[PDB]
Symmetry: C3
């Protein structure tokens, strides 16, 4: 484990995702509202999945070597197995908050799968220049997601209860800022141009992951928007 | 790229799926009917997924070598990753058109997963004679799907609006004819008996894919069956 | 095939899953109740999936070698591909029986995915002591599932029709007893401590699989709880 300088950030990430999972699990014990139960189930699964994948990276299972640039490059593939399941769950939290229609939910989840799937292909591609073709396709899929979150959901939240509109607006802004950083870290990190070393890259993804999952969840599950209007 | 004679058909397929995706995306911009939005989302995702997998084959990522018959045989595995997601989406288009019940939808999607999954196992199997055992199981799963589309959905469409009944009947006939060709191309192509060479096999799958996805989508999204009855 | 002593139990399992699939398929022909169709579709898919994965193990495709303990250990990875899809389908049978809320269904299916996913990682892990870390995480996920089936569903079934309450109680008890045996067989078998040899381990999993899928299905599909109350 300790033979890799980035191990400290993988261990911290593992701990923070595990602690986040347990807090949400305990906090959700005393909840019977069927609407609130939906948000607790979605939001608790997110850091639980991330916990297992951070642990796999810490123990060395989620790491492979990819030859490109005449070098064997360490690629943590477990990140994409994490994101494949956690990013659509996070979008479902937002879509259920605004009572989005089914067709829009399917478009979001499908574009998200394309985003993560093409990012994985780009991470494992051995022809250096082709890695950035996949990065560009994946980034186009992300821009579609961000467009929908702004010019489809925002207008839908305003016609909703005030507390669900204000909570959505906050979580929307958090998501757009944090998610946009991921393609940048990829491009300048060891998967892309190799400007930033792997140990610093790992620290950046850990800060982003914890903020986008645990921080996101703390804002959502403390809001009254997750409960139905009741007397 | 150009070192493979089949590259021209992979490049054409990539272009036609990309163009198809963009047309459906633009055409769906001016749509607010929640029913129509469902069909546009399903139908636009189909060629978008196929685009990415054709590109992976063009660039050489979606290709592996499988030893059988005393030879290293080029097997494009990316086809099955495509079909795993696009064939159930196409069946969902048909099932939603006739307002199929949930139990029937689950049976269709499950049989479809078995069809594609066993076809993938057959494509990667190293014992030559066993490849055709998997082909037979996969073909049995397809025949179940075709039976349901005829002796379960057809009777349901007649009790529906006339425009949804006539549109379903057309898309049903297109699907049964085109899908039935796939097991035949597999059997006589490089995955099976090896009668037809890979470059011709690739041309045939490209014609079938574009027809079953883009051609299918053009018929559906030009129909009024996708809109609810409104004044 | 016959070069492996466990082949006899893989062949028996294949036959019993295939026969089970055909019986459920025939029995479900004469069913039009939309509620009953749901249970028949879920319950017939379970042994059909298991059939294909037992066949892959029989023919040698679903087997790999994992080095640990200074030895190349035969690991049947196809079991986890089976369980990944069949265990959530079995939980869906139970959840639909008691009309569970959506949030609870998602929590069950998500915990089940974590259970199977971490068990697969543990089966393929090359550092011997780490294999049991994954076993423990997977077992914690199972205990969560069992808790929900007892202290969330049981109370919900009592407020239901008497026949659905008594049928659920029976299937609940069958599930908790049979599922609990799996982590024990893993721990003492070739994936874990290696006390029980592989051929005996394979026999035990076959008895458990057939009972948990075909036996489970025979109890459910003979009950009147799967039909709506009708005159
Ligand atoms: C009902 O809706 C509320 C349940 O949602 C919340 C239910 C959760 C979604 C269930 C998923 C958690 C499982 C219990 C998994 C247990 C293993 C975890 C990874 C444990 C990690 C923390 C600890 C080991 C440090
Ligand atoms: C509606 C939305 C959900 C739609 C989703 C969008 C999606 C279509 C976007 C594209 C996804 C696609 C790129 C997934 C590729 C997975 C692949 C990286 C797995 C590893 O295989 C890659 C190479 C080794 O580098 O295999 C070496 C050769 C091996 C012999 C490969 C044989 C196994 C194949 C991988 C079998 C295909 C399985 C499916 C891809 C499983 C789904 C994985 C997940 C990442 C989507
Ligand atoms: C709301 O419902 C309508 C949206 O459906 C339609 C929405 C679509 C389903 C969203 C999926 C498309 C994404 C925007 C993916 C973008 C990358 C594409 C693969 C681009 C391919 C064409 C071009 C690069 C040649
Ligand atoms: C309700 C419906 C959706 C049900 C679906 C029906 C489905 C059950 C039908 C059978 C599907 C099954 C054959 C999928 C097999 C995937 C497999 C080809 C992936 C590549 O692995 C094959 C060998 C190399 O040749 O791995 C070499 C050895 C490696 C060490 C393998 C270890 C990884 C395992 C593959 C882990 C299992 C992952 C799941 C199979 C992922 C789903 C893939 C998709 C193709 C279903
Ligand atoms: C409508 O709801 C009822 C259909 O459910 C029941 C429908 C089933 C869920 C459909 C799935 C079965 C498919 C027909 C697959 C056929 C291949 C099987 C694996 C055959 C195995 C048995 C035989 C080959 C020994
Ligand atoms: C809501 C719920 C459904 C959530 C589900 C819970 C889930 C997150 C729990 C953890 C699942 C995770 C451990 C799955 C790992 C699959 C992995 C074993 C496949 C084989 O790859 C392992 C190594 C060889 O040993 O690959 C060698 C290196 C290769 C180069 C690997 C590159 C391919 C990657 C495997 C791509 C990721 C694909 C996804 C993991 C596909 C889903 C598989 C299924 C088992 C979940
Ligand atoms: C909890 C994890 C989250 C919210 C991860 C989000 C990840 C992304 C938005 C990743 C995007 C990428 C691109 C847009 C292209 C480059 C490759 C990716 C996958 C890093
Ligand atoms: C857009 C792609 C489509 C509609 C693909 C359809 C593919 C099939 C219907 C494939 C069927 C197969 C068999 C029936 C057995 C032989 C292997 C397959 C997977 C080619
Ligand atoms: C039809 C198959 C069924 C119902 C299989 C159930 C399997 C389990 C409940 C497996 C549980 C495991 C653990 C709890 C940890 C050890 C590894 C597993 C996956 C065997
Ligand atoms: C979206 C965030 C990207 C900003 C990356 C900042 C990295 C600064 C760290 C110093 C770079 C290390 C280079 C010298 C080793
Ligand atoms: C009462 C609110 C705080 C509860 C404690 C939460 C502990 C989980 C770890 C959170 C750290 C990361 C927060 C986002 C920066
Ligand atoms: C379902 C369509 C299958 C028909 C295949 C027709 C192939 C004819 C092309 C000529 C065969 C090439 C053999 C000589 C190289
Ligand atoms: C107005 C209808 C035609 C629009 C142009 C569609 C261009 C997408 C490519 C379609 C070619 C394949 C059609 C099926 C044979
Ligand atoms: C949950 C069931 C686990 C019980 C396992 C009993 C196995 C007894 C078979 C004899 C053990 C073989 C050891 C000598 C070869
Ligand atoms: C009339 C009920 C029996 C029908 C025959 C079922 C045959 C399928 C194989 C069942 C054997 C396994 C039963 C569970 C132990
Ligand atoms: C194995 C991959 C299957 C999933 C394909 C994605 C489409 C799923 C459609 C689900 C239809 C709704 C069923 C109720
Ligand atoms: C990782 C594979 C999980 C999918 C298994 C297929 C069954 C899914 C059941 C979904 C139940 C409906 C939830 C609302
Ligand atoms: C185009 C939709 C408007 C909202 C999206 C904001 C774009 C942020 C740019 C992200 C940069 C990634 C490289
Ligand atoms: C048996 C259901 C009737 C409709 C299915 C038509 C069968 C077409 C044969 C396809 C040939 C594939 C080898
Ligand atoms: C803790 C929830 C109560 C019901 C679960 C029964 C636990 C059975 C123990 C299984 C042993 C697996 C190692
Ligand atoms: C080795 C660098 C080659 C540059 C390729 C950049 C491709 C980016 C595509 C974005 C449209
Ligand atoms: C090398 C050819 C061996 C023939 C096997 C055919 C199997 C087909 C099974 C269809 C029932
Ligand atoms: C080689 C045996 C090492 C023992 C590790 C046991 C780990 C079990 C963790 C359960 C909390
Ligand atoms: C609940 C605390 C979980 C912390 C265990 C993971 C941290 C790795 C320490 C080496
Ligand atoms: C929108 C046009 C997309 C065409 C790019 C793919 C074709 C491959 C050319 C080499
Ligand atoms: C319907 C009977 C299915 C039996 C075939 C599988 C058994 C393997 C025999 C070698
Ligand atoms: C993106 C930063 C999240 C901050 C988490 C703190 C929330 C406390 C209510
Ligand atoms: C299967 C052939 C499809 C033909 C596509 C043309 C549709 C234009 C309305
Ligand atoms: C767990 C044992 C199941 C027994 C199956 C027999 C059911 C006949 C109704
Ligand atoms: C009005 C809410 C502002 C939230 C933005 C937070 C950016 C990290
Ligand atoms: C909408 C604000 C985008 C912020 C992008 C930050 C990328 C590091
Ligand atoms: C009555 C519609 C006929 C459609 C069949 C088209 C076959 C390619
Ligand atoms: C229902 C007509 C089937 C046509 C099969 C064509 C196979 C090449
Ligand atoms: C295995 C075939 C079953 C025969 C019919 C059983 C009575 C519905
Ligand atoms: C009251 C029903 C008892 C069922 C338990 C069966 C254990 C195999
Ligand atoms: C609730 C009874 C548990 C039985 C466990 C059996 C494990 C072999």
């Amino acid at each position: 484990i300790t033979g890799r300088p980035e191990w400290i950030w993988l261990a911290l990430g593992t701990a923070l995702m595990g602690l986040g999972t347990l807090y949400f699990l305990v906090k959700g014990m005393g909840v019977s509202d069927p609407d609130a139960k939906k948000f607790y189930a979605i939001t608790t699964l997110v850091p639980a999945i991330a916990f297992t994948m951070y642990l796999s990276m810490l123990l060395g299972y989620g790491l492979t070597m990819v030859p490109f640039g005449g070098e064997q490059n360490p690629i943590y593939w477990a990140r994409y197995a994490d994101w494949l399941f956690t990013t659509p769950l996070l979008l479902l939290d937002l879509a259920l908050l605004v009572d989005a229609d089914q067709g829009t939910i399917l478009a979001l989840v499908g574009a998200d799968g394309i985003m993560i799937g093409t990012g994985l292909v780009g991470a494992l591609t051995k022809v250096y220049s082709y890695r950035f073709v996949w990065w560009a396709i994946s980034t186009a899929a992300m821009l579609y997601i961000l467009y929908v979150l702004f010019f489809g959901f925002t207008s839908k939240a305003e016609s909703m209860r005030p507390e669900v509109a204000s909570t959505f607006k906050v979580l929307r802004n958090v998501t757009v800022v944090l998610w946009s950083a991921y393609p940048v870290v990829w491009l300048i990190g060891s998967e892309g141009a190799g400007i930033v070393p792997l140990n610093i890259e790992t620290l950046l993804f850990m800060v982003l992951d914890v903020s986008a999952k645990v921080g996101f969840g703390l804002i959502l599950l403390r809001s009254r928007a997750i409960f139905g209007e009741a007397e």
